[PDB]
Amino acid sequence: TTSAGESADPVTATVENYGGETQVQRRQHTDVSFILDRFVKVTPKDQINVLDLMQTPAHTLVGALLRTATYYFADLEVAVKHEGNLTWVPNGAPEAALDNTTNPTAYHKAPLTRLALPYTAPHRVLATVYNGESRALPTSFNYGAIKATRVTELLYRMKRAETYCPRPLLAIHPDQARHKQKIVAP
Amino acid sequence: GIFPVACSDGYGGLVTTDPKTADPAYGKVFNPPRNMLPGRFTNFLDVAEACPTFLHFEGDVPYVTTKTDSDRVLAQFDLSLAAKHMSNTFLAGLAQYYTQYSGTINLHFMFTGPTDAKARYMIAYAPPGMEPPKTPEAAAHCIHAEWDTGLNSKFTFSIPYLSAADYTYTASDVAETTNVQGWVCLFQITHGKADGDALVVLASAGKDFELRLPVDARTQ
Amino acid sequence: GIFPVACSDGYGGLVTTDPKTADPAYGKVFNPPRNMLPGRFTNFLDVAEACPTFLHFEGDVPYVTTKTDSDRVLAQFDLSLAAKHMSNTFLAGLAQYYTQYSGTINLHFMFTGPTDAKARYMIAYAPPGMEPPKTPEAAAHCIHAEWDTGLNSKFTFSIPYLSAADYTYTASDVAETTNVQGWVCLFQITHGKADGDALVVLASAGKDFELRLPVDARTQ
Amino acid sequence: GIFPVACSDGYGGLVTTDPKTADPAYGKVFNPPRNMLPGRFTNFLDVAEACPTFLHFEGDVPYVTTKTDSDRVLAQFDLSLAAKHMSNTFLAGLAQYYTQYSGTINLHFMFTGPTDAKARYMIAYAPPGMEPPKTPEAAAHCIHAEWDTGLNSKFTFSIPYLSAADYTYTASDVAETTNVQGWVCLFQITHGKADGDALVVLASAGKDFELRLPVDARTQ
Amino acid sequence: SGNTGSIINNYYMQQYQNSMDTQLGDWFSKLASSAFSGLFGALLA
Amino acid sequence: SGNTGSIINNYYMQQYQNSMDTQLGDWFSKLASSAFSGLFGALLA
Amino acid sequence: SGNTGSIINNYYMQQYQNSMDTQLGDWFSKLASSAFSGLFGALLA
């Protein structure tokens, strides 16, 4: 389809332009609320872990796909394998309130304890990047902090996820003619 | 008595993608309002279909240069979403996190030459099975299309999805090096005083492009 | 057979704030009657809104003294519920057990001078971003208000809630020492024979003041 | 309180044939369409009833040769689905994975001689209890049937299911060597110039043949 | 109703769960809602 | 329907349990039911 | 609705499960559906 090449309005020259027809296309596996609510591993510290979603790595699935959005809203539920007792603390409380047990602790039940946390940020929508102080994110961009005796592996997933204002997403650079990796085979 | 159950075996382990939701612990939270906030996308294909993104050629550039010699092959790249030319595209950014796809892939071709340079091009789809064509005479027998540079300077050609199976793998096989999904060739046929002038290309998701089966194969 | 269940993993641990109620052990208890018993409050904000409580100034006093010199700044305190002046207030008593709030904070200003001493005052709200004003000329360009002492001797000024975000933290940050939520300044403009006379101040919850997200950060 | 249950004992172990389905882990999968695809069978008996398969005789052959001597016994094989003659049949292929059956077993008899060779045959069912008959005179007193070779060259004789019990074992007993389910004998009565000519036989499931109680006794 | 979050009915009736209250025969919500507002004198725009 | 034996409805809906089939727009039961029977010629009693 | 697969109703109500959203008083699906197609000039067969 010949177009106006610079107006940057969307054009889709479909396959009917040279004969043929299009089929019914289903897009459930690329939905933004379906692709983001599954568990991802992050590396923990020993005791205190702020529950920021931008400490998910950039090589994983829903860490590199969360950074597709500029602004995101999602309720977090965590799943942490620990020993001792794990106290969750809401957004913006003093970090001395991690030791107190009136805050929502979870007693140790083998092997791990998963629990659903609300969106406790003051902002209407969180963000993945912010040019305010030249890390380089405010202290308000967190779901709170969890503190145990020694956390071993704590996992994030983010549900009811709404995303806004897309950002570029990068696949790794081939040095060959095409990036050929060893696919699974019998 | 009490209601007897059987604590069944094999069930109840922690699965990372299950539809079981975790029990709450801290209720009565009212969020700040977010309604009619600008720039929301719902599915990742609508970003990939409404926003085309550049390709990659020799020299880390998105444009391809007209050729003032007897050879008329501007570009000839294999058709996969793990290709070398498709690598910096957003369409192959999210197709790095899936296993298999189907549907058309739009290619957008904007000519950036001056008003006195004229040229015409062709793009053909060579299905797999033999060697890809090296001349526009031999590539006339593909599912091709031609266009010349005039007032509207952009051309969009939808790559057909021809396959035996209904879905094709978005990851080219590590050992198998024949690339048996297909080649796409674009040539120049002639040019008038179009030396050193460019043809910037783009790629977008098609009208009926849909991906499938998400995995996490670590971001190359 | 019996009804099969799957004893799911990750669920069922003891959470201290959960809505699960414990199983009873000792029933058939009838309490003594308590109906229409005087002095019941339902929410802690209604006590904080219907009952204003004093502030704290230099010398452990709630009143501020008129100033017989060229300097006209009676009081200038930063606006937080973890401030030094707000510390003995009931409003900052229960705001020590939450994380963030929103809404107006009423300030009540009762003048306790004799019938021959007259004065007039002003109170301004300096939003954060630059230094707070030190003269009533410079503080005329805030969201201010003036009143003079006459027959009705009490003045109530509702502090506006201006913020970028929808909720602001009730705990001032430990490291960050700029106090980027705001200042509130109250001056005297003039006074007639009001030397040594007082202005007792109070604070109450506003009409639309509501707190959020309770924690337990140990009672300082 | 919470809903009390009793985690019952003895129940909930992993059984390999149970009707409990496993909990899913990865949803939203749409298969490629398969509708009206050719060659579908639903039950394994319909393949065994609509497609007859050959038998096994001495010399690894399916055909039986006419006999030019005083002895007139073409074949005499015991009636079991673990027999030697029935071994290469598809009907005894799937009856190796069950324990017991009932119903008729069709035997198909195609004559492959030239147009000048004529013969007639008989097939009798000798129920268990005494020795099987060795002459067509003695086997006239069974539930027999005769046919001669003419224009239609195929004959189908349905073996009756006579038994005390309602179901008979498809596995002949290891120690018990009398084969107390029955014999089936087929003879020739005469032949005209049919020397060296064949009678290829087949076997199929009957109209009312149905198997029962699947096991896995390792494919002999 | 409290800090309950269950839509199902309770298992134990009402009297093996709590202590039943008995009638015989609130304030600060009425006190905070009778608050004076506006002005005291003739205002201008 | 298979080797299921439950009268209760499934917990997971239909699409988190199986893979959904898609229409586009059997044999040996029709082959075994068209089988010839009886005789081929004129029978007697 | 998400990655849920349960046909039963939730146990915890709605406000002990998620954070409730508040109204006050989408784009790329409208952007991708206004895409131009067909041709630009007079076509032939």
Distance between CA atoms of residues A140 and C180, nearest Å: 14
Q: In chain B, whose CA is at the least distance from the CA of C210?
A: B30
**Contact of B205 with B98, CB cutoff 8 Å:** no
Q: In chain B, whose CA is at the least distance from the CA of G29?
A: B46
Asked if D37 reaches chain B (Cβ–Cβ under 8 Å), the answer is no
Structure determination method: cryo-EM
Closest CA to B40 of C219, C166, A69, C175: A69
Taking an 8 Å cut-off on Cβ atoms, the answer to whether C217 and A105 are in contact is no
Taking an 8 Å cut-off on Cβ atoms, the answer to whether C29 and E19 are in contact is yes
DSSP codes of every residue in chain C: --EEE---SS----BTT-SPPPPPSS---BPPP-TT-S---SSHHHHHHHS-EE--BTTTBSEEE---SS--EEEEEE--TTSSTTTTSSHHHHTTSEEEEES-EEEEEEE---TT-EEEEEEEEE-TTSPPP-STTGGGGSS-EEEE-SSS-EEEEEE----SSSSEESS--SS--S-TT-EEEEEEEEEES-TT-EEEEEEEE-TT-EEEEE------
Q: In chain A, whose CA is at the least distance from the CA of D25?
A: A38
Residues 9-38 of chain E whose Cβ lies under 8 A from any Cβ of chain G:
none
Asked if B38 reaches chain D (Cβ–Cβ under 8 Å), the answer is no
Reported in sequence order, the residue ranges of B137-219 that DSSP labels E, i.e. its strands, are 145-148, 154-159, 168-169, 183-192, 198-205, 210-214
**Contact of C19 with A112, CB cutoff 8 Å:** no
Instruction: Work out how many CB contacts closer than 8 A connect D with F.
Output: 66
- Shortest Cα distance, chain C CAs vs residue B149, angstroms: 51
DSSP codes of every residue in A127-172: ES---S----S-TTSSS-EEE-SEEEEEEEEEEEEEEEEE----PP
Residue B19 with chain C: CB contacts under 8 Å: none
Using a threshold of 3 CB pairs under 8 A, tell whether chains D and C touch: yes
Interface residues of E toward B, Cβ cutoff 8 Å, are 3, 5
**Contact of C52 with C92, CB cutoff 8 Å:** no
Q: In chain C, whose CA is at the least distance from the CA of E4?
A: C19
Dihedral, CA atoms, C14, C20, C22, C27, nearest 10 degrees?
180
Interface residues of E toward C, Cβ cutoff 8 Å, are 3-6, 10, 12, 15-17, 19-29, 31-32, 35, 37, 40
Local structure of B44: helix, strand or coil: helix
Residue G31 with chain B: CB contacts under 8 Å: 46, 50
Distance between CA atoms of residues C180 and D125, nearest Å: 105
Interface residues of A toward G, Cβ cutoff 8 Å, are 1-3, 9-14, 17, 33-34, 37-38, 75, 116, 118-120, 159-160, 166
Give me the residue label for tokens 């039911």: F33
Burial class of residue B198 in the structure, from the number of CB atoms within 10 Å of its CB (0-12 exposed, 13-18 middle, 19+ buried):
middle
Interface residues of C toward E, Cβ cutoff 8 Å, are 17-21, 23-24, 27-35, 38-43, 46-47, 49-50, 152, 207
Closest CA to D83 of D167, D205, D179: D179
Taking an 8 Å cut-off on Cβ atoms, the answer to whether A120 and C218 are in contact is no
- Could you report how far apart the first and last alpha carbons of chain A are, in Å? 44
User: Chains meeting E at 3+ CB pairs closer than 8 A?
Assistant: B, C, D, G
Using a threshold of 3 CB pairs under 8 A, tell whether chains G and A touch: yes
Nearby residues of B144 by Cβ (< 8 Å), 6 or more positions away: B122, B123, B124, B125
Domains and CATH numbers, chain C: 1-220 (2.60.120.20)
Using a threshold of 3 CB pairs under 8 A, tell whether chains G and F touch: yes
Taking an 8 Å cut-off on Cβ atoms, the answer to whether B24 and E3 are in contact is no
CA-to-CA dists, residue C128 to A120, B76, C122, angstroms: 24, 60, 19
Q: In chain D, whose CA is at the least distance from the CA of A25?
A: D30
Closest CA to F35 of D90, D109, D50, D110: D50
Residue F36 with chain D: CB contacts under 8 Å: none
CATH of the domain at A28: 2.60.120.20
**Contact of B104 with B210, CB cutoff 8 Å:** no
Pairing of strands D5-7, B3-7: parallel
**Contact of C74 with C67, CB cutoff 8 Å:** yes
Distance between CA atoms of residues D61 and D41, nearest Å: 29
How would you label D134-169 residue by residue, b for 16+ Cβ within 10 Å and e otherwise?
eebeebeebebeebebeeeeebbbbbebeeeeebbe
Distance between CA atoms of residues B139 and B160, nearest Å: 16
**Contact of C169 with A138, CB cutoff 8 Å:** no
- Shortest Cα distance, chain B CAs vs residue D13, angstroms: 5
Tokens at F10, concatenated: 């499934």
Tokens at C12, concatenated: 């069922």
Q: In chain A, whose CA is at the least distance from the CA of C215?
A: A103
Domain of A44 in residue numbering reads as 1-186
- Shortest Cα distance, chain A CAs vs residue G21, angstroms: 10
Using a threshold of 3 CB pairs under 8 A, tell whether chains F and E touch: no
**Contact of C187 with C77, CB cutoff 8 Å:** no
**Three-class secondary structure assignment of B51-75:** CCEECCECCCECEEECCCCCCCEEE
Local structure of B166: helix, strand or coil: coil
**Contact of A36 with A73, CB cutoff 8 Å:** no
Identify from D21, D26, D34 which residue to disrupt to test chain B contact, counting B C-beta atoms within 10 A and taking the largest count. Answer: D26
**Three-class secondary structure assignment of chain D:** CCCCEEECCCCCCCCCCCCCCCCCCCCCCECCCCCCCCCCCCCHHHHHHHCCEECCECCCECEEECCCCCCCEEEEEECCCCCCCCCCCCHHHHCCCEEEEECCEEEEEEECCCCCCEEEEEEEEECCCCCCCCCCCHHHHCCCEEEECCCCCEEEEEECCCCCCCCEECCCCCCCCCCCCCEEEEEEEEEECCCCCEEEEEEEECCCCEEEEECCCCCC
Taking an 8 Å cut-off on Cβ atoms, the answer to whether A139 and C171 are in contact is no
**Residue ranges per structural domain of chain E:** 1-45
Local structure of B145: helix, strand or coil: strand
D204 phi/psi in degrees, rounded to 5: -140, 165
Dihedral, CA atoms, C166, C171, C177, C180, nearest 10 degrees?
20
Local structure of A96: helix, strand or coil: helix
* Cα F10 versus chain centre, distance: 23
Using a threshold of 3 CB pairs under 8 A, tell whether chains C and A touch: yes
**Contact of C200 with C112, CB cutoff 8 Å:** yes
Closest CA to A116 of C11, B30, D3: C11
Reported in sequence order, the residue ranges of chain A that DSSP labels E, i.e. its strands, are 2-3, 40-42, 48-50, 69-83, 86-89, 105-106, 113-116, 126-127, 145-147, 150-166
- Shortest Cα distance, chain E CAs vs residue G11, angstroms: 6
User: Chains meeting D at 3+ CB pairs closer than 8 A?
Assistant: A, B, C, E, F, G
Distance between CA atoms of residues A175 and A181, nearest Å: 12
- Find residue G15's DSSP bridge partners: none
Instruction: Work out how many CB contacts closer than 8 A connect A with G.
Output: 48
| Domains: count for chain A | 1
Asked if A164 reaches chain B (Cβ–Cβ under 8 Å), the answer is yes
Asked if C1 reaches chain D (Cβ–Cβ under 8 Å), the answer is yes
Structure resolution, Å? 3.1
Q: In chain F, whose CA is at the least distance from the CA of G5?
A: F12
Residue A139 with chain C: CB contacts under 8 Å: 173
Give me the residue label for tokens 């954070």: G19
User: Chains meeting F at 3+ CB pairs closer than 8 A?
Assistant: D, G
Residue C169 with chain A: CB contacts under 8 Å: 92, 122, 140
- Shortest Cα distance, chain D CAs vs residue B22, angstroms: 15
Asked if G8 reaches chain F (Cβ–Cβ under 8 Å), the answer is yes
* Cα G29 versus chain centre, distance: 8
Tokens at B63, concatenated: 């444009």
- Shortest Cα distance, chain D CAs vs residue B35, angstroms: 29
Residue B3 with chain D: CB contacts under 8 Å: 3-6
Supply the CATH classification number for the domain E1-45. 4.10.90.10
Check residue B83 and report its DSSP letter. B
Closest CA to B65 of B196, B184, B202: B196
Nearby residues of D132 by Cβ (< 8 Å), 6 or more positions away: D76, D126, D183, D185
- Could you report how far apart the first and last alpha carbons of chain D are, in Å? 60
- Shortest Cα distance, chain E CAs vs residue C177, angstroms: 36
Residue B7 with chain D: CB contacts under 8 Å: 7-8, 11-12
Residue G3 with chain A: CB contacts under 8 Å: 33-34, 37-38, 159
